[PDB]
Amino acid sequence: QQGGEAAQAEAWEWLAANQLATVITTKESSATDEAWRLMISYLDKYESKNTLYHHCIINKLL
């Protein structure tokens, strides 16, 4: 989020290693949307009944 073109270009190197390809992107794939959908997927698969990890990321954000 703080970086830019070099950041997203490098980040794709490990986004591919995390293997996300499904779902159409608009106006070409952007690492931002890539990470957002990645985290959403991590959520919807591993779902704790108490928003534990919601809290975790929120607190790192703060």
Binding site: V23, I24, T26, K27, T32
Partner: protein
């Protein structure tokens, strides 16, 4: 040169709008008859009642078509607190056979409990969204992810637009260095309130719409609001319809260097203001090239305004639905 009849279609009620194909030949009438009538201009041109099916409850004010890359899909609004979505799907493989057609509600956005004052799809360059506004002062912003995945609709965004929403407008945008904006004309009545029209932008780093502007000047319930088609036009213009006619030019004078977004520095001129309709002006309709504007009001007349080589503006047509307009006209200085 087509003489006018008062004879109307079999709609036993007020006819609200008619929507035409963004690729041609196809039209449809929406009315208070609650039945949506799809007409098709034949090769001879004869348009006949090719389809008619119920779509809503209450007065179905507006039908909006979407380009077939959206699918052959349509939105519609009525007194049902919701917005209905129909794509026409047919059977079989169209090679030299034409099977049976069928109207499909992909979705209907419940839109909380608020009456959809306006609703329409989203522009190409920003992905495929759709916007709904209501007299709640709240604008809901729904999303369909994938191409075969149409029926599903998730409120991607919402913009709270102070007074009750009446008329909405998308900003044309086709540059990555440009941003999508929305103008909102309010039909609430408050002479006190200036800026009855509110303007929001997508600041991309914030990932979010902020208020770009208001028209601190406007205290008149806005009938309709209409961006001028501006994509090669290096600034923007706005047509604003109430009892009078407002035309504004918005030029990026400062685009910021490290503080862009929130508000960006634009000169706004009231480059035109007219009461020539001599009555309340309901709608202004743009030419798709963004060079022509039509204007109608209660007197059932339409005045037709263009820009010159000084870009200033003249009425080049005056069309009467309460009478018979006169012929040609041309002039210079």
């Amino acid at each position: 040169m087509f003489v006018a009849r008062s004879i109307a279609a079999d709609h036993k009620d007020l006819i609200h709008d008619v929507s035409f194909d963004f690729h041609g030949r196809r039209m449809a009438t929406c009315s208070s008859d609650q039945s949506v009538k799809v007409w098709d201009k034949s090769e001879n041109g004869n348009w006949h009642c090719t389809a008619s099916w119920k779509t809503h409850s209450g007065s179905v004010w507006r039908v909006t078509w979407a380009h077939p890359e959206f699918g052959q899909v349509l939105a519609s609004c009525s007194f049902d607190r919701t917005a209905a979505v129909w794509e026409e799907i047919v059977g079989e493989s169209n090679d030299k056979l034409r099977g049976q057609s069928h109207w499909v509600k992909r979705t209907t956005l419940v839109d909380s409990r608020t009456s959809v004052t306006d609703v329409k799809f989203a522009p190409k360059h920003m992905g495929l969204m759709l916007a709904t506004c209501s007299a709640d002062g709240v604008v809901r912003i729904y999303e369909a992810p994938d191409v075969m995945n149409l029926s599903q609709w998730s409120l991607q965004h919402e913009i709270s637009c102070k007074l009750s929403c009446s008329c909405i407008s998308w900003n044309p945008s086709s540059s990555r260095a440009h941003s999508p904006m929305i103008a909102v004309g309010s039909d609430d009545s408050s002479p006190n309130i200036m800026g009855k029209v509110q303007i929001y932008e997508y600041n991309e780093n914030t990932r979010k719409y902020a208020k770009a502007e208001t028209l601190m000047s406007v205290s008149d319930p806005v009938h309709d609001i209409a961006f001028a088609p501006n994509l090669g036009r290096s600034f923007h213009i706005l047509a604003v319809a109430t009892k009078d006619v407002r035309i504004f030019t918005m030029k990026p004078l400062r685009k910021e260097l490290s503080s862009s977004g929130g508000v960006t520095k634009f000169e706004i001129h009231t480059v035109a203001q007219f009461d020539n309709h001599n009555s309340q002006v309901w709608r202004v309709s743009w030419n798709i090239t963004g060079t022509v504007l039509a204007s109608s009001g209660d007197d059932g007349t339409v005045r037709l305004w263009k820009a010159n080589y000084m870009d200033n503006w003249k009425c080049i047509g005056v069309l009467k639905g309460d009478g018979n307009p006169v012929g040609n006209s041309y002039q210079g200085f």
